[PDB]
Structure formats: structure tokens, C-alpha cells
Amino acid sequence: MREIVHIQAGQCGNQIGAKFWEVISDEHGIDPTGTYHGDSDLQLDRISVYYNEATGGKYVPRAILVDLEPGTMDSVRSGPFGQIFRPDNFVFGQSGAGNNWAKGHYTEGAELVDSVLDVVRKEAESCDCLQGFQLTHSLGGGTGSGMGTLLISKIREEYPDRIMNTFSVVPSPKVSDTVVEPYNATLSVHQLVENTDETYCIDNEALYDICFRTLKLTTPTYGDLNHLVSATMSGVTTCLRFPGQLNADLRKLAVNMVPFPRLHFFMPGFAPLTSRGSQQYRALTVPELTQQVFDAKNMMAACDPRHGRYLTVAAVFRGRMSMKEVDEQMLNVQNKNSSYFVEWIPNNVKTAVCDIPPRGLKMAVTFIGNSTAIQELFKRISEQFTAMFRRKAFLHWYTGEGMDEMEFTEAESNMNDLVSEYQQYQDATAE
Amino acid sequence: TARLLIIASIGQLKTLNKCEILPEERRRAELDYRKAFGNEWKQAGGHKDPEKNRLSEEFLTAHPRYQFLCLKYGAPEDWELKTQQPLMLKNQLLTLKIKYPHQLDQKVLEKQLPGSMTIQKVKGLLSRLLKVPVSDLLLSYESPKKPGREIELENDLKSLQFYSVENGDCLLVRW
Amino acid sequence: LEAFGESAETRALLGRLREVHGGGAEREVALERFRVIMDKYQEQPHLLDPHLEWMMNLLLDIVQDQTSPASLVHLAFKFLYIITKVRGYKTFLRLFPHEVADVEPVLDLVTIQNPKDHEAWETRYMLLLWLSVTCLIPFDFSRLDGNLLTQPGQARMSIMDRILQIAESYLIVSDKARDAAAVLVSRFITRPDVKQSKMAEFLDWSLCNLARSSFQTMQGVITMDGTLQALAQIFKHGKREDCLPYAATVLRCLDGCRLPESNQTLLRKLGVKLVQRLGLTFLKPKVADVPEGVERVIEQLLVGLKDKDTVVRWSAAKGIGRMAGRLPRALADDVVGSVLDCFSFQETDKAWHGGCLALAELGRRGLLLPSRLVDVVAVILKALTYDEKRGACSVGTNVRDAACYVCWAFARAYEPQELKPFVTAISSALVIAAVFDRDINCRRAASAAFQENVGRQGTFPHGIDILTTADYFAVGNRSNCFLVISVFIAGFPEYTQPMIDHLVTMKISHWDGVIRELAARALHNLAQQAPEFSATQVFPRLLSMTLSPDLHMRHGSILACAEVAYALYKLAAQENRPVTDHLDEQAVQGLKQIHQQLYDRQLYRGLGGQLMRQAVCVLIEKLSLSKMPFRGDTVIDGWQWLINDTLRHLHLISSHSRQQMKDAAVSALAALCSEYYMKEPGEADPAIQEELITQYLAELRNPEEMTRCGFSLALGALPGFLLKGRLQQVLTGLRAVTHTSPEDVSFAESRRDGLKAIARICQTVGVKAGAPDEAVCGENVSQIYCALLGCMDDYTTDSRGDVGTWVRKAAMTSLMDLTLLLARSQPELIEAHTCERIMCCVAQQASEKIDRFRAHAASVFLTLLHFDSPPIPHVPHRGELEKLFPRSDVASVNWSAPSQAFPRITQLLGLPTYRYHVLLGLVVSLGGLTESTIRHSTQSLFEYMKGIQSDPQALGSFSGTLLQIFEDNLLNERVSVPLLKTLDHVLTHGCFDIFTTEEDHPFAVKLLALCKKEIKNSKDIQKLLSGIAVFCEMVQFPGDVRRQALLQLCLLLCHRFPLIRKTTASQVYETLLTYSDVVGADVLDEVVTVLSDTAWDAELAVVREQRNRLCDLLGVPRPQLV
Ligand SMILES: Nc1nc2c(ncn2[C@@H]2O[C@H](COP(=O)(O)OP(=O)(O)OP(=O)(O)O)[C@@H](O)[C@H]2O)c(=O)[nH]1
Ligand SMILES: [Mg+2]
């Protein structure tokens, strides 16, 4: 019984966490009342990984909400599934940070870190075997990313033998109109490269393009981006929430998908892509699903895996299919003399099989790739860092709080070194 | 491929060729047997309707363990018995219409482009046709599904399928 | 932010409500727009105070209209709620209406609310608070009802009755409406009529809720929290003579509820809150006969300070402070004594936070007596220095925060004469903490307390002087507080010895290495303000700490000793006196036993071995840079050894601290050789010069890589006087490693370090024209330049990636360090051919695809070109390069960004000498894999080709250079696919549109043959695709080349891989659709149908016929099996 303590910081992180919880509640079979009305034995086979055992068979999530203002904390408490969460799991302040990393990491963040670690320890003590920690947040805000990095560092210092997962979200100009989002994006990346094991990059530019073109939406909002993020998250943790022949361990999965301790960034994808309301279209075969999941269009990141090198790949299918079909497909794809040869799939994919598809779909597939193309994203924000740091724009907001230009130079050097290492390993021999 | 059938022909075969059989093995073998013999079940007079299921005798003698599986995991659907055909270039072409907002008096041109055709080749074709430089030809499209909403094709290394292009769209050329 | 500069936008957004309430996408957009506009003032919402009223009235004239639909009313209430979270309800509700005509319109709206509608929770929240702001009306609820017997058959229910039935229902909900129900009852039961009518009923309901509810059932916990909050609010905002009668039954029930043992943090906090609310109902409010329940309340509130959460500790401290302020002066002493018990030795650090909070709360009111000064103060001195390590984590932040809070509350707890006895121990504590504290919150917490103390009292030594400098913003950077403000504070005699003692005791023995280094660097400067005290008292102290069993303490003490020795040497160097004047024989005697006491305890093993080596190397460097008196003593022979061993065991050091270790060892060796290895002025020891050099040279051949890497930098750090007649050997030994041998294929770091070592050696010896084995002369200058250029073509590619690039970096910084030297001595040595080759190589390494090496190369090029003192001779097109890169524009250029580098590098093609190399370098970027780099390079290349496309001569020379580059890299896998992709792009763009006029051009006639020879017998899929694209783009050239390309395209259509077969046809279709003159209209409807119908991914034998049929249409001879 491996228990994973879930965490969600910032407005975007809290919203993504709530959406993912509400999505998996319908798959596991737990009504929002806090009881299980599911009719499948496989559902309760691994429910303890994300739910606690209370009196009367009531399942309580393991999430820990954290913020610096109360607005979003109040919206989730009154949401469709706002009763399952414990009232004492909501930690918040009043003033917020103000889209400032120094104010959300060193002042208010470090001020509420005590109350947050209180609940973190209270939750960790109620677990038979703790596996790791998960956090959902963004990188274009102050409170969110600041408190996320601070809590990650604290959990690493107090629990060095625990895995860390961060479903960080990369901002984009087409979604936000804030000028200091590059600075906060650079600092969080520097902190994560030092205190993280897994980082699922979820670009906010790829999701917007998908919602605008694929879904054919006139004016997409955060509701068309959060649904996709929650769907991808549910598709990623399909093995960690249900049985499976493949090894569904978090530590072993991270070890196999983290061959490099600085290139631990993973691009996640999922086909078929659906919107809100309309989700029951058709049932795609295994070949079509594999072709769509490995397509740059079904990628949550703005980078294309084809423009790089495949280091590690993890595929997870769910629906009504046998492992033999997936194995034959994956073996014929790499066969250069077959009639189904492609040029965007490596010669080793960790395939998985499941019998519990999501809601509104009969079959689904998820892919996670440690390709080097993600470096492109690291170069997209870096350029912006050069169009501000050189002019010292809005630097009095950071230096006035306590930060030094020595912290900015170190973060820039770390980002440059990461990009250089990625580009260097991209040119390695494929032996 | 034959082993899975053997386990599918016997119900209480817990061991075969000195190898234990698990529920995973039983389910894999039972899903393969249904995936392989679904097509024939339709032709033999099969239908999901519990009152319109009238199968012949030969199909029953050849598959006397196919009716129990029909109830164990339901009957095969129509979308599960269409995986025996390859693809052709004819099935990858997109019929689009070429328009010029600046010159409306021109006729409505129509072309057929592959699905994986990059924007670079389309720009080169348009330059060779209209005799316009490649750097002076901007590209957009409109779909009958999304009317009055123009999109931009600023990236040239991408393909038409990445931009969500489908049969029936219309391209607009400006210079 | 001075004012609200978004009034028009907010007004328009509010007005658009009446025509966006029927939309689902626009509604969310407007909501998200209203949220982001209002969140800008979350840190200072008071600036919005002048606007509140108008926006509130706008949202009110939409929810206060009878033609308003439910959906439109729900958006207005959502907006209203958005304005109450940012300003808060306590301040925003004072402007809401409160007229007697708003009592029934608001209660009737409260009676059409769906409790099961989770989407409309903001509506219910705004409803309850409005109903509560309407219970202030100074009239009886009876006067409003009028006559209840007007409806025969069914009498109407009273307004007060309806409100009691609204509050009881909303106080057991799971949404945020329950919190709005807590604010309603607080203004419903606390009035006269309701007090006499429904107080008993509500109390019975609450006592029933807390008599049946549990902390296990979810709804039970929901019932517990709401009831406790309601009771607390009633006892807070309720009269004391209407409440005291019920205080006896409420506490008796709370005691039986068992809250302390329950596993809920909110329930316990509310319980402590209700216990402190009942506690003050028994006493009389004071303005600065003890029932038995007060003792039980105190016993409960003194057990709420040892809680496991701070949210409950703060509430317990507030309750204790509020209770002590009401009790007589006698029980106050007992309460203080009982609270002081929290600071016992057996109590944990959590109990200390609550104790300090209670002490601060007591001092804020001025209840602590003078007799409690010798004790309480004695505890604070420790709470300010609380910083322990509990396993892998650290604790002591909240303790120091509470200590600073207590210190800030002592400026009003005692008179200036009452606290006059402890202004020497508390001023030293405040200052010391604000200066060395780790956390920034504590530092500014100590800064505010000191400011308040010097403002109210003003008896601290140099209060204004210390406050002006160490202000709120000055203590923001931790580095500034340790190396700058610390010296300013130590300038006075009242903050010198205490600060040094605190630094040497705790900070030196800290668990963090960065903190220890900062403390050592701070002591370095502090020793200047107190040399005698640091040489007679601190040095014995640190010397005894170097013999401690603790590893971190030993490292810190060694660093402190080294820094103090360096400071004493610097200070003595001013008066021109030896360093022995400060340190005594016993002090210099103990500085010669540190390393022999570490090596004899085997303290150089394990994880601490690297730290001990670093500390000892820093100490040796600081001692050698001071000219200590250890010459001739065997101790020197020890130090040297400890260096060599390090260079011999670098692979044992972790990968996160090997570079720093190597650098420190090299620096220590350099400082030692230029101090303890000199026989006479200008000469060196013959025995050591020989043995060290032979050992180092023989070590260079060790198969281990890290050893060679270390010994390279070691050779590159020796002084100049030790290489007066051994340069001809050291240079040869260094060049022997720079060569790539069959065994040293993946050995790149060794050569990277050898190049850097050759740079340093060449810089130290300088140039002397005539002396080969002493200095760089015209005899050993060519060999150096040849060895440096032979490492610029290091494109070694392994499973680690393109590691060779690293070596290339060492070739850009080395070649520079040499050139700049010659120009500053003998510019004649800089030959023309060598300079041209160096410039062309720098140009190629600055037109690469990697972004950090390309940026390094451009900077080196600019530095070599912007050299004017003197100007480097023999510079091809020097003026041209200078005009292309003016000094004014170089000040702001993003070379790392391809967009701000490729358009500036592509212009170099205009120069003939650069045209070739620059293109060979840009081909890798034009045919690499990075998408942004490919796009930028292609755009910059087309921007330059547009200027020479209509020129037969320039275009011809460009094509010739491209083909020469292709031929030179024939069969080269690192240049074949990229150059093929570049050619494909250039052909697709139509740059060579002039050569397509005639037939059989000398360009394509050989380009096609080269492509054929390149793709002859190739299995790579990418190479095959590139070749197919090139052969499908080359069709534009008429003549025999067109027919040969068509024959190749037919040959490739029938390949072993069906994928290639399909891609060839897919590309041939596009090629035919592009160029129409290639095939006539008489056989054009016969090719498209065959390509669309024929399945090129099926049987190859069947596709051979269709493919052969397409050879009889295109007119291509049909090949056969040879
Ligand atoms: N995809 C997505 N991005 C979001 C969402 N909410 C916010 N963002 C992005 O998050 C970034 C920062 O905003 P938040 O995360 O809400 O801010 P915060 O992290 O709470 O920080 P403070 O405002 O300083 O308190 C911006 O770039 C937004 O575009 C959301 O629901 N979905
Ligand atoms: Mg926020």
C-alpha cells in the first residue's frame, strides 16, 4: 500500500488539482458525498494510493490546498466535489504575493510555510508507506511558483528519501499579459533543476493553440485548458491508480525515465483530444491512437519531439485491448522493412494495458517523452530574460525585497548550462 | 497465435504445455478469439439483438465456445471488425479552393494537396503559379465549420495536417 | 499604485452584464477579466476605497430590479463577492443599504435560494451577509410584521422566526454559506427582542448539535465547526450580563465534547477560541469573586500552547493575553509563572513558540512585573539564538520570530528606568540577530523591534545611528549584512566582542556550508576593527575548534583561522612589519600541526574528506599568500603532498564539487610554489624544480582522465621563475596530451585542460626574443599555434554527445590569451596566415547551432577585432568587419539568441576569405534539428541571397563554394544530411532560378553526381529522405539532369522500405504539381491517377509493374536487375 500525498499551490495549481480530482472521482466510482458506488473490483484494488480509509467506508482525498489569498480557496470549497476535502486541509493568507517571486518565496511564502508543513506532516503521518510527493502549480505567477519551490525544497530537506513530482505549467503571452512572468519562470526552473526528480512540462501556448484550432473554439478560456490538463494527468497516472502487468511503481518509473538528473523534464501527450460537453465521438483503433498520441498536435508542450532525440518513452493505453496488439504494433513500427514504418518513435517504449477507460470514451492512450526538444521551450523564455535583465526593468520589486542580481545571474547561467547540455546530448550516437 | 486459441477452446484448461495459466492469460486469449472470429459471426447471422441472433450450424460446430464469450464480454461492435485494409495516396489528398481577397474577379481555383505537404512546398507552388516571390506570399485558411475566423500560417516547416486542415477548406493568398 | 487607473474598463465590464448574462464563453471571459483587474490591488486594496460605493451600487441596481432573471442576478452577486474578498466584508459591508425598507426584500430573496446549487454559492454568501447588515435596524422585528392573523387558515411566520430557521439551516451546510451564517447570528441573537425570544432555543440547538455531533462523520465535523464558530462570535459580540448566565453550561458541554484529543486542527482552534470567549465573561473588563470556572479555563488555555500546530498556539497565546489583562494583579504573577514553564529543558521547540507568543501578548498590555525581568529576559536571550537541526531538517525560525515579537513588545511593557538594567544584553541581542540571522523574516523582524525600541524608549547605545543604516530595506540582502553593515556596527565598542563571540560560537559551528563561508568572510573584515582581540582571543578559540571531533565545526574553525591570518597579514602589510607580530610562537606553532593532526586521524576519507581537503587547501593558500615563516621546515613537504594526492584522487570527489576542489588545489599549489620554492632572487631550488617537474610530467601518461585534467592545470599554474630552463620540456609534455590517440579517443577533458594550461604558462613567462627554454620566443611560438589549432577540429561524438565542443571552447579562450599577449609584446610573431586561420576558425565556431558555444565564439571574435592597443596586424577585411559590428551596437547584442546572431553572421558571406568557412559552419545550423535555429538560419540566408540572386557571378561563386564544401565533406555523416537539407531548402525557395534557363549547367551536372555518390548504398532513413527531396527539387533544371533525376526517382520508388516507397511517390506528386513544364498535358492525367490509385506500400513485385508503367509515361528508361 503505497500512499502519495497530493499538493496544489497557486490559483492555476489549485484549479488543475480540483479538476483532476473531480475527473478521477467519476472513474474510481466515488460519489461527491464521500462514499463508493462503483461496481468494479478493479476500482478499489488500488484506491488507497490516493484516498484514506475512514469510518463508514468514506474515502477522503489526500490533497493539501495552499494559497496567499482566499478567493480560489473559497471557490474550490464550494465546488461540485468540495465536501470530500477536509476543512483543515485549506491553508491561506490575505494579501497574496503580487506576481512577485521574492514576495511569494521569501516573505509570505516562508511565513505560511510553517502552517503548510503542519498539515503536510499531519497527512504524511497517516500513511502506511509513503512513496513520494506531487505538486501542481504554474511558473508565471508569484504565490504559485514561489510557494511551490519553497515547499519542494522543504520537503527535500526534511525527506531526502522521497520522490518529487511537479506538473509545472509554463505561461505564454497569448494567455497572460504580465511583463514579470519571464523572471518568475527562470527562478522556478533554477530551483527545480536543483530540487526535483520529475517535471511534467505543460506549456500554456500549445494548449491554447489546440483549443483554438483543433477544438475550433472562438474564445477559449481556462475551462478549455484545465480540462485538457486534467485529462492528461488522469492518463499519466493510469497505472498508479489501477492494476496492471507492467511495473506501476513511482520510484522505478522515475529511475527508468530519469537517466539524466538535469534532463528530467518530460513532455506529456494524449489522444484522442476532446473538448467539454462533447466527448463521445468514436473509438479509434490502436494504430490510429498510437499515431495521434505521438503527433506534435496532441502534445501538451509547444515543442515537437521530432525536432530532437528520444531518450525515454512511456506509453499507457486504457480501454478494451490486449497487450499482444500493442506489442505487435510497437514492434512493427520500428521494423524498417514493414508497411507501417514511421520516423518519430524509438526502439523501446514502456507499454501498459488497462481495462478502465475514461468517461465518454471507449479507448485512450497517454505518452510521456524525455525528448531533448523540450530545450526549445527553455530557450523561448530565456530570450525574454535578455530583453529585461539588461534594462533592469522592474528590478526594484525584487531587489527591494531581498533578492540580489547575483541570484538572477546564477539562474541564467544554470538555464544556459541546461540548454547547452541538452543540445550536446542531442548529438549523441544512437548505438 | 494458435496457443491463445487452444486456451479459448477449453474452459477448464488451467495448464498448457507445462505452464500455469493466469486470469491475465485467460483474458488475453479470450479477447484474441473474439477479435479473430467477430467478422465470421456477423456473416453467420449474428447480431447483438438478444432476439435477432440466428447463427448457422457450421459456425457453431467450428466455434462452440463463441456464444459464452459473447455474453462474457458482450458482442463485437461494427467499429471492431474493420482492420484489414491499407492506405493509398488517393486517401491522403485534400481538395481545397484558392482565393485572392485582393483580386475577386479571378476564377475559383481548386487543387488537390497531400496531407503531409509542408507549407514551404505550397508557397513555392503559389510563387511559381502567380509569379510572386516566396517571401511576399502570406498564407491563411478558413473552414465551413468555422466561418469568418481566419488563421495564420506563419510557420513554414509545419504540415497542413498540423494546422487541422481537412477536406473542404479554402485557402486565401495575399501579396 | 497611487489611484485606480482602470475606471472606464471596469465601468464598461459592469455595464456589459445586461448583454453577456446569456453567454457561456463571454461570461467566463468577463469574470476572468474582472478577477485579474481586481487582484492587482490585493496587497493594498485601500486605494479602491473611493470607488467601492459606485461599483457596489452598479451591481445592486441589477440584483435589486424585479425584471432581473436569476442568471443575470447570479453574475452580479459573483461580482459583488469578488469585491468583498479583495476589500473584505468587514469594511465593504458598511456601505450596503440599511433602510427599514430592505428587511423583507432581502429575507424574501434569502427564501428563494437553492441550498443544493453548488454553482450559485456566491449568491447565498452575499445573501446572508446582506441579511446580517440589516439586523442593525434600531427597531423590533414585531413592528415590521404588522398583523400575522391576516391570512385565515394559515398564519404567516414572523421575520425573526424565518431568520432563526435560515441561520439554523445554513449553519450545517458544507459550502462557504456556513461562514456567512456565522456572521448573521452574531448580529441576530445579540439584539434585545431576539435575546428574549429565541436565545434559549438557539442555545438548546447548539448544545444539542455539540451533544450529538462527532469529529469522525464528515457532516458531524461540519456541524461541530459551525456551532463552535457561532458560539465564539456570540460570546465575542454579545453583552456580558445576558451571556454570563449560560457560560457555566457551555463550558461543561465543551469539556465533555473532547476537542483536545480529537484529530482536527480547526475544531481545536475553535474550541480554544470558545474557551477564551467564556473565560472573559466571568471577569470584569479593565482599562489600564474569581469563580471556579476561571481556573478550569486557564488550565485549558495553558495546554493550548503545547499544540502541534501554530494556528492553535497563536489562539492560545491570544486567549492567555486577554485573560491576564482582566484578572487582578495577584493572579497575573501566577499566570506568568505557569506560562514560563513552557521553556523547560524537557519541553520541545513547539512549546517555546507558544510561550514566547504568550509572553508577547502579556507584555503588549503591560502586565509583566519588574520582578519577572531577570527571568523572562534570561529566556529571550536564548530564543533569539534558537537554531537546531532535527535530523535532516532545521528548526528555530518561528522561535526567533516570536522572540523578536517579544522584544518589540518590551518598548511599552516597562518604563525607561524599569528596563535600564538590561539595555546592554537586549541591544546586543537585537543588533546581533538583525545582522547575522539566516532568515530574512527574522532579520526584518529584529529590525522593526529595534526601530520601535529606539523610537519609544531611545536608551540603546547609538540607536539612531544603527537605525539609519540598518533600516528595513538595508537588511534585505543577507550578503550585505555580513560583510558591510557588520563592520559599520562593529565600529562602535559596544557591538564588537559580542558579535565576534556569537559568530565564532554558533555560526562557525553551523550545518550549512554557505553560512559558514559567509561567517568566515565576515570575520575576515571584522578582524580589522579588532586586531588585538582577534589575535589574542579568537585565534586560540578557532585553533582549539580545528581539533574538534565535529566535521562541520572543524571546517568552520579552519576557515576562520585562515581568514583571520589573511586579515592580519593584510593589516601588517600596511605598516611594513612581519605577520609574526600579531600571532605568537604558540599560534604559529599550532598553524604547523593542523594538517599532520588531520592526516594522522585519517580525517580525509568518507564524505567529509572533500570538505577537509578544501578547508586545508584554503588554509594553505591563505598562509602562503602571507609569507609565513615555514621555509625549510618539513611542514611544507607535507602541504605539497596533500595537493598531489588530491590531483591523484579527483575521481573520488563527487561530481558536484570536483571542479572547485581542483581549482582550490591549483591555487594552493601556485601560492606555495611562488613562496616556499625560491632559492635566490630570480632563481629556484634545483632539487624541487627537478623532482616536481619530473613527477608531474610522468603523471600526464596515467590512463586515468581526472588525474591528467588536474596535472594539466597544475602545470598551468607554476610561476615563471621555475620555468626558466624547462619550458622546452613542459610544452612538449602538454602537447603530447593534446593529441588524439587510438586509446585516448573519448579523453576530451584532458586536452581541454592542457590547452588552458598552455595559455597560462605562455602568459606567465611572457615573450623574450632569444630565450626558447625560458620564454615564448620566435622559435617556440609556431609549435604553440599549431597545437592550439589542432584542437579546433575536435568533433568527437560519443554516447555522452558532442563532448569535443568543450575542447573547442578551450581553443577559443586559449588562442585569444596568446594573441593578445603577442600584440602586447612582439606583434611581429602574429603571422598573416596564422591570424587568418584563427579568424576563419573563430568565424566557423560562431556560426554553429549550439547557443552557448556560438555566443562564446562571437564574444571572442569581437574581443579580437576590437583590440586597438595595439591593433592586431593582418586582419582580412578589417574595416569591413568593423563597419559590420560597430562598437556602439555590440553593447547590446543577444548572440545566444539565433534571431540576433544569424542575420549578423550571414553577412560575412560577402567576404571571399570568410565566405567558405562561414558557410561550412552555417550548413550545420541550416540542416540541423532545432526548429527555431533552422528557421532563423534559413531566413538570414535568404535575406542575403536576395541581394545576389540576379548576379550570374555572385550566385555562381556561391554555388561553387557550396559544392566545394560538399565535396570536401564527401561521405561525411556529420555534413551529408545537413548540407542535403540546406540544398533542398535553397531549391524549394527558388534561389537558383537563373541557371534553370539554359540546359545542362555546370552546377547541377556535378551536384547530381555528388548526391548519387553520397546516397549510393545508404540505409539511413533520414539520409534517404534528404536524397529523395534533393532529387525531387533538382527536377527544375532541364536537360539530361531532369531525365536522370526522373530515373533516380523511379529507382527509389521501388525501395526495400515501404515507407520510402510511399514518401517518394508523395514527393513526386508535389514535384509534378509544382513544375508543369516537366511533363506535357498529353500524359498528365495518366500520372496522377497511377500515383493516387497504386498502393506503393503493398507487394513490391506488384508495384514494380505500376512503377515500370510510370517509366513509360515520364519517358524514363526502365532499369533491370544487374
Ligand atoms: N492553464 C492555466 N493557466 C492558468 C490558470 N490560472 C492561472 N494561469 C496562469 O498562471 C500564471 C500565474 O497566475 P496564478 O498561478 O493564478 O498566480 P498565483 O500563482 O496564485 O500567484 P499570485 O498572483 O502572486 O498570488 C499566469 O501566467 C496565468 O496565465 C488556469 O486555470 N489554467
Ligand atoms: Mg492568485
Q: By CA distance, what is B156's nearest residue in C? A: C935
Q: Are residues A380 and A367 in the same domain?
A: no
Which value, in Å, is the radius of gyration of the alpha carbons in chain B?
Answer: 27
Q: What is the CATH number for A361?
A: 3.30.1330.20
DSSP assignment, residue C415?
-
- Written as nine digits, the cell of C726 is 624547462
Q: Is A296 on the interface with B (CB under 8 A)?
A: yes
**What is the C-alpha to C-alpha distance for residues C819 and C830, in angstroms, rounded to an integer?**
7
Q: Are residues A244 and A267 in the same domain?
A: no
**Kind plus residue range of the DSSP H or E element containing C38:** helix C25-38
Q: Are residues A292 and A239 in the same domain?
A: no
- Written as nine digits, the cell of C841 is 576558425
Could you count the other beta carbons within 10 Å of the beta carbon of residue B134? 17
DSSP assignment, residue C536?
I
Q: Is A174 on the interface with B (CB under 8 A)?
A: no
Handedness of CA A158, A160, A161, A164 (dihedral sign): positive
Q: Are residues A38 and A95 in the same domain?
A: yes
Q: Are residues A207 and A309 in the same domain?
A: no
- Comparing CB atoms, the residue among C931, C1069, C1096 nearest residue B114 is C1069
Q: Which of A259, A285, A309 is the last residue of a domain?
A: A259
**What is the C-alpha to C-alpha distance for residues C130 and C1051, in angstroms, rounded to an integer?**
84
Could you count the other beta carbons within 10 Å of the beta carbon of residue C813? 13
Contact C391, C458 (CB under 8 A): no
C400 Cβ contact list (under 8 Å, min separation 6):
C383, C384, C385, C386, C387, C433, C437, C439, C442, C445
For residue A199, what are the domain limits?
A: 1-259
* Dist. CA A63 → ligand 2 center (Å): 19
**β-strand partners of B172:** B99, B140
Q: Are residues A318 and A345 in the same domain?
A: yes
Q: Please indicate whether residue A171, judged by its CB atom, sits closer than 6 Å to ligand 1.
A: yes
* Dist. CA A12 → ligand 1 center (Å): 5
Q: Which of A215, A234, A259 is the last residue of a domain?
A: A259
Give the mutation target among A12, A172, A210 for probing the ligand 1 site: most ligand atoms within 8 A of CB: A12
Q: Is A356 on the interface with B (CB under 8 A)?
A: no
- Which method, experimentally, gave rise to this model? cryo-EM
- Regarding beta strands A163-166 and A129-136, do their DSSP bridges make them parallel or antiparallel, or are they unpaired? parallel
- Regarding beta strands A90-91 and A63-66, do their DSSP bridges make them parallel or antiparallel, or are they unpaired? parallel
Q: Are residues A325 and A423 in the same domain?
A: no
Q: Please indicate whether residue A142, judged by its CB atom, sits closer than 6 Å to ligand 1.
A: yes
Among candidate residues C541, C499, C545, the one with its CA nearest the CA of residue C522: C499
Q: Is C1009 on the interface with A (CB under 8 A)?
A: no
**What is the C-alpha to C-alpha distance for residues C52 and C44, in angstroms, rounded to an integer?**
14
Q: What is the CATH number for A395?
A: 1.10.287.600
AA letter at C387: D
Q: Are residues A111 and A250 in the same domain?
A: yes
Kindly report the protein residue whose alpha carbon is nearest to atom 12 of ligand 1: A141
CB contact residues (below 8 A), chain C span 797-826, against chain A: 797-803, 805
Q: Please indicate whether residue A107, judged by its CB atom, sits closer than 6 Å to ligand 1.
A: no
Q: Are residues A183 and A245 in the same domain?
A: yes
Contact C86, C40 (CB under 8 A): no
B83: which chain A residues are within 8 Å (Cβ-Cβ)?
285
At residue A226's C-alpha, the angle toward residues A223 and A232, to 5°, is 140
| Chains with at least 3 CB pairs less than 8 angstroms from chain B | A, C
Handedness of CA C918, C921, C927, C931 (dihedral sign): negative
Domains: count for chain A: 3
* Dist. CA C21 → ligand 1 center (Å): 25
Q: Is C156 on the interface with A (CB under 8 A)?
A: no
Q: Please indicate whether residue A222, judged by its CB atom, sits closer than 6 Å to ligand 1.
A: yes
- Written as nine digits, the cell of C123 is 449568491
C218: which chain A residues are within 8 Å (Cβ-Cβ)?
34, 58, 83
Q: Which residues of A are annotated as a binding site?
A: 11, 69, 138, 142-144, 204, 226
**Phi and psi torsions of A52, nearest 5°:** -95, 160
Q: Are residues A183 and A272 in the same domain?
A: no
Q: Are residues A140 and A201 in the same domain?
A: yes
**What is the C-alpha to C-alpha distance for residues A386 and A392, in angstroms, rounded to an integer?**
10
- Written as nine digits, the cell of C610 is 572533500
Q: What is the 3-state secondary structure (H, E, C) of chain A?
A: CEEEEEEEEHHHHHHHHHHHHHHHHHHHCECCCCCECCCCCCHHHCHHHCEEECHHHCEEECEEEECCCCHHHHHHHCCCCCCCCCHHHEECCCCCCCCCHHHHHHHHHHHHHHHHHHHHHHHHCCCCEEEEEEEECECCCHHHHHHHHHHHHHHHHHCCCCEEEECCEECCCCCCCCCCHHHHHHHHHHHHHHCCCEEECEECCHHHHHHHHHCCCCCCCCHHHHHHHHHHHHHHCHHHHCCCCCCCCHHHHHHHHCCCCCCCEEEEEEECCCCCCCCCCCCCCHHHHHHHHCCHHHECCCCCCCCCCCCCEEEEEECCCCHHHHHHHHHHHCCCCCCCCCCCCCCCCECCCCCCCCCCCCCEEEEEECCHHHHHHHHHHHHHHHCCCCCCCCCHHHHCCCCCHHHHHHHHHHHHHHHHHHHHHCCCCCC
**Phi and psi torsions of C493, nearest 5°:** -75, -5
C175: which chain A residues are within 8 Å (Cβ-Cβ)?
77-78, 82
Q: Is C121 on the interface with A (CB under 8 A)?
A: yes
Q: Which ligand is nearest to the CA of C32?
A: 1
Q: Which of A357, A373, A389 is the last residue of a domain?
A: A373
Among candidate residues C572, C682, C586, the one with its CA nearest the CA of residue C627: C572
What size, in residues, is chain C?
1122
Give the mutation target among A69, A138, A202 for probing the ligand 1 site: most ligand atoms within 8 A of CB: A138
Contact A235, A316 (CB under 8 A): yes
A321: which chain B residues are within 8 Å (Cβ-Cβ)?
31
Q: What is the 3-state secondary structure (H, E, C) of chain B?
A: CCHHHHHHHCCCCCECCCCECCHHHHHHHHHHHHHHHHHHHHHCCCCCCCCCCCCCHHHHHHCCCCHHHHHHCCCCCHHHCCCCCCCCHHHCEEEEEEECCCCCCCCCEEEEEECCCEHHHHHHHHHHHHCCCHHHCEEEEECCCCCCCCEECCCCCCECCCCCCCCCCEEEEEC
Contact C910, C839 (CB under 8 A): no
Q: Is C176 on the interface with A (CB under 8 A)?
A: yes
Q: Is C931 on the interface with B (CB under 8 A)?
A: yes
What are the angstrom distances between the C-alpha of C132 and each of C98, C125, C508?
10, 11, 59
How many helices (H) and strands (E) in chain C?
Answer: 57, 2
Q: What is the CATH number for A63?
A: 3.40.50.1440
Kindly report the protein residue whose alpha carbon is nearest to atom 26 of ligand 1: A140
Contact A217, A160 (CB under 8 A): no
Q: Kindly tell me the burial class for residue C50, based on how many C-beta atoms sit within 10 Å of its own C-beta (0-12, 13-18, 19 or more).
A: exposed
Q: Are residues A367 and A415 in the same domain?
A: no
Q: Which residues of A are annotated as a binding site for Mg(2+)?
A: 69
Q: Which of A103, A278, A423, A431 to mutate to test the interface with C (most CBs of C within 10 A)?
A: A423
